[PDB]
């Protein structure tokens, strides 16, 4: 598996237009693009509001928030049994792949993804906040 | 960014990852508490702080622990 | 004459209050007939009022400047000047019953702890066991002090405490 | 083998546990080098709605 | 009627019966002994 | 044939086996309790039939039999009111003198001193003065005897037992299938022809044959003992042809369409009866004849088994516009598939109807001697107003529940519901703006007047004197309905109400109904009404449209309808659910209707109700509403402080219980603030520190003590808040108006 | 009347100090949250999990005690 | 007199609430359980449930009975 490049030639589902779509965050900070290959035309539920019709084949869809993309991801994975993958697009054109960051979905092991933010102690073996006092910023004993 | 720490009481039931609505958590093999999986939080820049993860953790109290930190656009669920 | 209070038997505002209430009731009575349901009801209420005032004045109560009876909660002032049946005796009269309720509840809980599904004998009362304990719990002070003297009234420190104890 | 038997009653010594100083019954003890190998089942559930939890050999004690 | 008597053994029905009985006892006490302010008898 | 009876024989066995097992209706609670939250969930999910199962047939059967149980309970309550008017009332004394004797139908037992509550109401009676208006309703029915109330009570108990037998039957013995409930064409045809058409026709028959002659003789001074009995007015046509000579013609004028001959008992008089202060029963009889015809022709509209008629699916599907996409398609399926979609609409219109009832029962008092019982009139406005607001909030609730559970986006593509959910942001944004605009321009007017009159600038207030905001549109409508019989309703002898204008009707010295003027104070309070209504709509509609998703939480539908929060994340997500929007819409419904009923009470006591002893109408508060209600200090002083003198000095009198429920309601309302201001996590730790003391003494229960759910805390808090506030207002109203009115 | 209102005053004092003492002592930990010291003094909640953790901080205990203090005074 | 009394009493109530608030902040931010090993301040936290439960009992009794007497009158 290798990181897929975002295809802009991918069509979008049949949506009649909403008001829950993109805001100035898309133009200024960032927005998100989710893609998936469908086997048929199915009326799914937009996380922004309203129902859209996915197209037979590949689809592409814009969203202003990552939680929207993962909501649709779990909806397409659980109700339609698809395998979508979304990105993070910046207004200058930079695309950043996000969800299956190793190819497989994060609930499954991949035999090589590194464990981050793992405290190797018990939650009661954390120190008292008096020991992490005056560490610069206000810091939790979990660090 | 919020602080998500995962402790060695994790029995590796994948529930915290399935519950996460932002893809912050993932399950790493054997480079943790023991073999047979373990969880991890590499993408905490996308954590909003909903604590669905520790709502779904079945261990005593919570192996996964969200400590609410500095907020941002990604950590406040803003589409604007 | 404990705290400057006058006895209700010789209090003047007490009698004035009795006369006021009876005057109100007879004012209501004058608009009705001789033997009607309102008339009999108001006559019964007047008699209840008269008996109530007579029985409070007979019981040795102490009345204030307002004519209302004032109770004496202090034992020693109540036991000396004959006012124990105001707050002091009803104190133990309450506590017997209250500890009786609590002891029956405790005994029922301890009884249903041993069963297979103890929680279902709490939403569904085991009325046989409950009535047996409610009848045999009338000796709750003796049994309570005997459970206390044996050390089997209090649980040890197997109690579920917090991380900083 | 390590730990208690697979039907024994066990008092939990984990301070942050819901069942601290509370009696539980062993489901099983994983005989590997796993940390927190003892699986204890409790008659009463915690605030999350769980009755089972994994504890270490130093967090368990008889009766 | 084992199940019916089990139903009457439930918490709310037993509470209704017991508090009806308690309230009726107190009510009849307060009828036959009107205005009991002190323990004089 | 399509529309037919379709039932299953003996679906559910009749046994107490599932009575002994609480929580049987769900998969989670049937396992038994371990924590106390089970005890609350057992009750919260008791009638949540659409989560006990998935098949709409069993849900529908449960609903049907539950409706039967509600009807049986309503019949028990009605029979109880008739029975209390038969045994424990001064009704037969009140009929002889309704202008002097206070209607009472509740006697109190003399146990702990509450015999003081048995007030001197009149007629040689001692009881609680009722304000439900049953005496006026019974006089309008033509009762005139306690035996008829007794037998009506026994008939109500018979019908209650019948309804409960019907529920048991239609659940356990022969329960209908789903395709029977789904015949909405037949249900509407029948509920319009037979229920509301034939019901109004039968009530018209009673009004022709029993109410009209009995009440005509009652108004002619005849004693209720010497009035002919209704069966004697049925058999002996001579009595009726003496009272109405058109009864000498028989029913021929109907079949010959010489209906004008019936103009003796089918009138269009309008206005009020000068002797009773209520609507003419001939007017109501003609009314019910007319709406019976109207509903019987309306019940022949939909197509059931013979090709004539309409298919509602065809009306809906063929109603679409260029602005609105596919239109009403899929709505037939929504409403024949979702019980909650039906319940939402039905509750909304039923509550709006109850408020219609409240507004149309005081301006057009239908019953004799209803208007001059100011307590009954005030209570009957307040009660139905409150019931309407509650039903409307429930309509929003069940619309949200539909949107969460029963909504399917496949059925709804570019139909009206999809197109609403797609632009909910425009909807709620414009609603927010109008709520803000109205809040400013309706309440800041009151603040402006407070500031001006506090600064000593009464020439700068918003009053009928300084800066007039006259309600010219409502004034024009008043004048348009006052002048209606002259031009636009020539066969009406008078206007519908005297509130439009004209002469007053005073009965027994008391003012039954008089013209109602509207000025700047009325403008301001009406705009306050619209403001509060719009905010309640904002909350409930925002809960509906954002019940599945928002820009905050896109997966709110999977979270559910009733959930506290997703977390403290996204800055904090508490009360994002569509349940918590109902929880807040309840508060705003209370705030709206409190002001509505306050407007009613003050306007009525100041500008309508009163006595005419000499030449001059002397009102209760002296017409201060015009000049005093420009300020919040006005509603404080001259309404909440002035009209509270009767409830706080009621101690030692018959109305003392009203003062008691004043104080206790102030208690309960504030008690609600323990649940609304606080949060569960504090009480769980307090509870566990208490459980430590229970463990130490070996009295810790097996059912683990938990703090109430978050949702349950909010529900308890809103319940205690509404109860205390509404009961405070109830006590204040009744104690005030039973004394001064 | 002085008796009754002095006992109301006792109620208010004891309940205010109950809330405050409880927040102070459970500031470091509860059975619902034994790692409460790791979250600071004023944190919003610990989520809807474990039954619900609203107003669980010590800050919120002080908060709820200010109401009972205002009532006491 | 009225203004002075009400003033200083409300000031006192707020100050006394802040006292316990900062005691909580002490327990969180400044308390060291190992440097206070066995002293009175740790002995408070060791029997905190007794303090909280007895304060709760006093508050509960006083409220029950004061409200009961007031409602009775
Ligand atoms: C919590 C505070 C409080 C207190 C201390 C009281 C105290 C009292 N109230 Mg007040 N009251 C209160 C709250 C309170 N009330 C509230 C909140 C309300 C509003 C609802 C009222 C409303 C109210 C009214 C309206 C009246 C009272 C009355 C009374 C008196 C009742 C005496 C009585 O019933 O003799 C009972 C005497 C006994 C000996 C019974 C004790 C209990 C058991 C039965 C004893 C055990 C004996 C035996 C072993 C049982 C056999 C077992 C059985 C199973 C066979 C007493 C002065 C009445 C009165 O006249 O006051 C002066 C009265 O009319 N109260
Ligand atoms: C709660 C505390 C309290 C207080 C402040 C008082 C106050 C007083 N007591 Mg009382 N007393 C109390 C509890 C209390 N008593 C208790 C619990 C008992 C045991 C039942 C007594 C038994 C008692 C006696 C026997 C006498 C007093 C006397 C007195 C007075 C000295 C004073 C009025 C004396 C007295 O009569 O005062 C004039 C006296 O002789 N007290
Ligand atoms: C909405 C229904 C309703 C309501 C709220 C009431 C309420 C009341 N009824 Mg009425 N009643 C009703 C229906 C209702 N009734 C019906 C349907 C019948 C016909 C069977 C009666 C027949 C009836 C009689 C014959 C009497 C009452 C009485 C009473 C009072 C006391 C009841 C009591 O203590 O029972 C105790 C209940 C239990 C112990 C259980 C109370 C005001 C009594 C009353 O007011 O006396 C003055 C009385 O004597 N009721
Ligand atoms: C549902 C409403 C209703 C009902 C039930 C009645 C009923 C009645 N009206 Mg009224 N009426 C009504 C509405 C109603 N009216 C309205 C809306 C108007 C305004 C237009 C009038 C205007 C009006 C006038 C002007 C008069 C009546 C009259 C009558 C009576 C004569 C009926 C008649 O001749 O019709 C004929 C009806 C039938 C032939 C049906 C009889 C059916 C029987 C009961 C069948 C049962 C037999 C059974 C199968 C076997 C026996 C069982 C057993 C013994 C073995 C009757 C009491 C007259 C009267 O008596 O005045 C007091 C009269 O003069 N009505
Ligand atoms: C035709 C009327 C109608 C019908 C059939 C329903 C039916 C339903 N509603 Mg809806 N609802 C209605 C009106 C209606 N509601 C109104 C008017 C409101 C506004 C208050 C609501 C608000 C509402 C909400 C917010 C919710 C429902 C829910 C439900 C479902 C379960 C209800 C349940 O189990 O409660 C069982 C009954 C109780 C728990 C009892 C409530 C206790 C009340 C509040 C006590 C106070 C009442 C009393 C008169 C005051 C005196 C108190 C005295 C005893 C001291 C069920 C489908 C729930 C649902 O479907 O979610 C999944 C839900 O969450 N309803
Ligand atoms: C008195 C108490 C109070 C007040 C003033 C408000 C005020 C408001 N609520 Mg809130 N609310 C309250 C209690 C209150 N609420 C309670 C107890 C509940 C129950 C939980 C709610 C639940 C609730 C919900 C659920 C909603 C509101 C909404 C609103 C707004 C609608 C009215 C509006 O914008 O008009 C304009 C503002 C006013 C009328 C407030 C008074 C301001 C006056 C006019 C003077 C202005 C001063 C001026 C600027 C000079 C400044 C001086 C300078 C020195 C600063 C407004 C902010 C709604 C909202 O935000 O959407 C629109 C909404 O959806 N409220
Ligand atoms: C000698 C007295 C004293 C001192 C030095 C401190 C010092 C401190 N306190 Mg303590 N505190 C005190 C008294 C004191 N407090 C009292 C009396 C109380 C009870 C009221 C508290 C309750 C308390 C809590 C609960 C917390 C602190 C916290 C703090 C710290 C930061 C304060 C902060 O956030 O600033 C910024 C504070 C503000 C901007 C205050 C908000 C505005 C206030 C409420 C005034 C609003 C009034 C309004 C403007 C009036 C308008 C009137 C107009 C309408 C007419 C700091 C160590 C915090 C801390 O240490 O965090 C861990 C913390 O959480 N204190
Ligand atoms: C009028 C409002 C009100 C009332 C009555 C209470 C009452 C109480 N609060 Mg407070 N509280 C309030 C507002 C109120 N609060 C507000 C606005 C807040 C801010 C959120 C708080 C915050 C708060 C905290 C933080 C704490 C309390 C605590 C307590 C309890 C103190 C113990 C006590 O006095 O027991 C006496 C109890 C009462 C007087 C209330 C019960 C009323 C009667 C006696 C019960 C029976 C009535 C009747 C028979 C039942 C009818 C029901 C049904 C049959 C219809 C008590 C339940 C403390 C606690 O829980 O410790 C124990 C505590 O820690 N409260
Ligand atoms: C209220 C007047 C709104 C203006 C008006 O006249 O609307 C009328 C306008 C016309 O709708 P249509 O005739 O296309 O709708 C046909 C219906 O059968 C629904 O399909 O309704 C809309 O476009 C949607 C609602 C607009 C809501 C705008 C609120 C401002
Ligand atoms: C006071 C309060 C509590 C504590 C309330 C406790 C848990 C329950 C109140 C009383 C219960 C119902 C016990 C009453 C007695 C039982 C019904 C059993 C009967 C036993 C005898 C009395 C018959 C919360 O859990 C809560 C949660 C979320 C927001 C606000 C609050 C809140 O304000
Ligand atoms: S808080 Fe929410 S977003 Fe953050 S890790 Fe936990 S579940 Fe994922
Ligand atoms: S839910 Fe808890 S136990 Fe399961 S994998 Fe996540 S952290 Fe580990
Ligand atoms: S309800 Fe309580 S737990 Fe949920 S988000 Fe709000 S504060 Fe946090």
mmCIF file of C-alpha atoms in Angstrom, chain C residues 81-143:
data_model
loop_
_atom_site.group_PDB
_atom_site.id
_atom_site.type_symbol
_atom_site.label_atom_id
_atom_site.label_comp_id
_atom_site.label_asym_id
_atom_site.label_seq_id
_atom_site.Cartn_x
_atom_site.Cartn_y
_atom_site.Cartn_z
ATOM 1 C CA UNK C 81 -41.339 21.989 86.034
ATOM 2 C CA UNK C 82 -43.552 19.292 84.536
ATOM 3 C CA UNK C 83 -43.102 19.762 80.789
ATOM 4 C CA UNK C 84 -41.498 16.465 79.811
ATOM 5 C CA UNK C 85 -44.362 15.377 77.581
ATOM 6 C CA UNK C 86 -43.842 18.342 75.269
ATOM 7 C CA UNK C 87 -40.553 17.654 73.472
ATOM 8 C CA UNK C 88 -38.665 15.294 75.736
ATOM 9 C CA UNK C 89 -40.875 12.210 76.017
ATOM 10 C CA UNK C 90 -42.021 12.419 72.379
ATOM 11 C CA UNK C 91 -38.309 12.474 71.589
ATOM 12 C CA UNK C 92 -37.869 8.879 72.700
ATOM 13 C CA UNK C 93 -41.331 8.071 71.422
ATOM 14 C CA UNK C 94 -40.049 9.088 68.011
ATOM 15 C CA UNK C 95 -36.646 7.486 68.288
ATOM 16 C CA UNK C 96 -38.054 4.087 69.199
ATOM 17 C CA UNK C 97 -40.194 4.097 66.058
ATOM 18 C CA UNK C 98 -37.483 5.544 63.839
ATOM 19 C CA UNK C 99 -34.797 3.117 64.920
ATOM 20 C CA UNK C 100 -37.448 0.433 64.576
ATOM 21 C CA UNK C 101 -37.998 1.359 60.938
ATOM 22 C CA UNK C 102 -34.265 1.567 60.334
ATOM 23 C CA UNK C 103 -33.553 -1.725 62.068
ATOM 24 C CA UNK C 104 -36.253 -3.550 60.147
ATOM 25 C CA UNK C 105 -34.804 -2.142 56.940
ATOM 26 C CA UNK C 106 -31.301 -3.178 57.951
ATOM 27 C CA UNK C 107 -32.454 -6.666 58.896
ATOM 28 C CA UNK C 108 -34.297 -7.053 55.598
ATOM 29 C CA UNK C 109 -31.239 -5.969 53.644
ATOM 30 C CA UNK C 110 -28.944 -8.300 55.563
ATOM 31 C CA UNK C 111 -31.486 -11.073 55.054
ATOM 32 C CA UNK C 112 -31.746 -10.661 51.284
ATOM 33 C CA UNK C 113 -27.982 -10.265 50.830
ATOM 34 C CA UNK C 114 -27.505 -14.024 50.836
ATOM 35 C CA UNK C 115 -29.987 -14.901 48.106
ATOM 36 C CA UNK C 116 -29.215 -15.614 44.465
ATOM 37 C CA UNK C 117 -30.664 -12.404 42.989
ATOM 38 C CA UNK C 118 -30.639 -9.977 45.932
ATOM 39 C CA UNK C 119 -31.712 -6.993 43.849
ATOM 40 C CA UNK C 120 -34.987 -8.607 42.806
ATOM 41 C CA UNK C 121 -35.986 -9.005 46.458
ATOM 42 C CA UNK C 122 -35.671 -5.221 46.745
ATOM 43 C CA UNK C 123 -37.943 -4.189 43.887
ATOM 44 C CA UNK C 124 -40.191 -7.139 44.756
ATOM 45 C CA UNK C 125 -40.601 -7.163 48.517
ATOM 46 C CA UNK C 126 -40.478 -10.556 50.223
ATOM 47 C CA UNK C 127 -43.555 -9.725 52.268
ATOM 48 C CA UNK C 128 -43.307 -12.871 54.414
ATOM 49 C CA UNK C 129 -39.758 -12.014 55.445
ATOM 50 C CA UNK C 130 -40.630 -8.327 55.650
ATOM 51 C CA UNK C 131 -43.591 -8.905 57.961
ATOM 52 C CA UNK C 132 -41.672 -11.368 60.102
ATOM 53 C CA UNK C 133 -38.901 -8.834 60.618
ATOM 54 C CA UNK C 134 -41.378 -5.991 61.081
ATOM 55 C CA UNK C 135 -42.989 -7.933 63.906
ATOM 56 C CA UNK C 136 -39.810 -9.203 65.545
ATOM 57 C CA UNK C 137 -38.024 -5.851 65.284
ATOM 58 C CA UNK C 138 -39.954 -4.345 68.178
ATOM 59 C CA UNK C 139 -36.966 -5.133 70.402
ATOM 60 C CA UNK C 140 -34.660 -3.039 68.296
ATOM 61 C CA UNK C 141 -32.839 -1.224 71.145
ATOM 62 C CA UNK C 142 -31.844 -4.416 72.920
ATOM 63 C CA UNK C 143 -30.870 -6.237 69.742
#
